Design an enzyme around this catalytic site. Structure first.
Site, mmCIF file in Angstrom:
data_model
loop_
_atom_site.group_PDB
_atom_site.id
_atom_site.type_symbol
_atom_site.label_atom_id
_atom_site.label_comp_id
_atom_site.label_asym_id
_atom_site.label_seq_id
_atom_site.Cartn_x
_atom_site.Cartn_y
_atom_site.Cartn_z
ATOM 1 N N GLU A 43 6.007 2.042 3.439
ATOM 2 C CA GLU A 43 6.360 3.522 3.541
ATOM 3 C C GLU A 43 7.527 3.835 4.059
ATOM 4 O OE1 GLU A 43 4.354 5.402 2.073
ATOM 5 O OE2 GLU A 43 2.297 4.501 1.963
ATOM 6 N N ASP A 84 7.226 12.575 -1.728
ATOM 7 C CA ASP A 84 6.855 11.411 -1.979
ATOM 8 C C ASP A 84 7.089 10.816 -3.435
ATOM 9 O OD1 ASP A 84 4.522 12.336 -3.406
ATOM 10 O OD2 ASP A 84 3.221 11.398 -2.152
#
Ligand code: CL
Ligand code: CL
Length: 162
Positions: free
Chosen positions: A11, A20
């Protein structure tokens, strides 16, 4: 290696709001803020989650706090899910981490729908499950990450991550 380090690698860590892989406003270590297109809505959600006027930026500690909450919530979501728990209960420690990783990324509902893969994992048919997991939008959209998670399920080691 452990779940925390593994997810931190998958991440990343960003201290300012970002979008994202799917274009959704996120911050920290993959902490999704909202699916809305409004940056204001994101900033609002952010201030509500941190408990202060952030102006879109947080500290390392705050990011790590969101991360803790998020990992905890993923595990708890797994344990309360009738489809997931039995799978998780059947796996070894390393493999459990792979399942947590998927839930973190895609939600409990998302993963709970990989019915066929789930069954294979439960049966300990590693190579078969690896193949089946790859036939998914998840794999096609984020192939590098998916590969790491899949090798983890296949081998029961952390090799995809030394
Ligand atoms: Cl939360
Ligand atoms: Cl990827």
């Amino acid at each position: 290696m452990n779940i925390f380090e593994m997810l931190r690698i998958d991440e990343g860590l960003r201290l300012k709001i970002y979008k994202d892989t799917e274009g959704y406003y996120t911050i920290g270590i993959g902490h999704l803020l909202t699916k809305s297109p409004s940056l204001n809505a994101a900033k609002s959600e952010l201030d509500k989650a941190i408990g202060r006027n952030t102006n879109g930026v947080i500290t390392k500690d705050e990011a790590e706090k969101l991360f803790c909450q998020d990992v905890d919530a993923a595990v708890r979501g797994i344990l309360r899910n009738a489809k997931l728990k039995p799978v998780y209960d059947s796996l070894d420690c390393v493999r459990r981490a792979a399942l947590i990783n998927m839930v973190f990324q895609m939600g409990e509902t998302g993963v709970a729908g990989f019915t066929n893969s789930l069954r294979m994992l439960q049966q300990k048919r590693w190579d078969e499950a690896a193949v089946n997991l790859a036939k998914s939008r998840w794999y096609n959209q984020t192939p590098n990450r998916a590969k790491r998670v899949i090798t983890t399920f296949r081998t029961g080691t952390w090799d995809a991550y030394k």
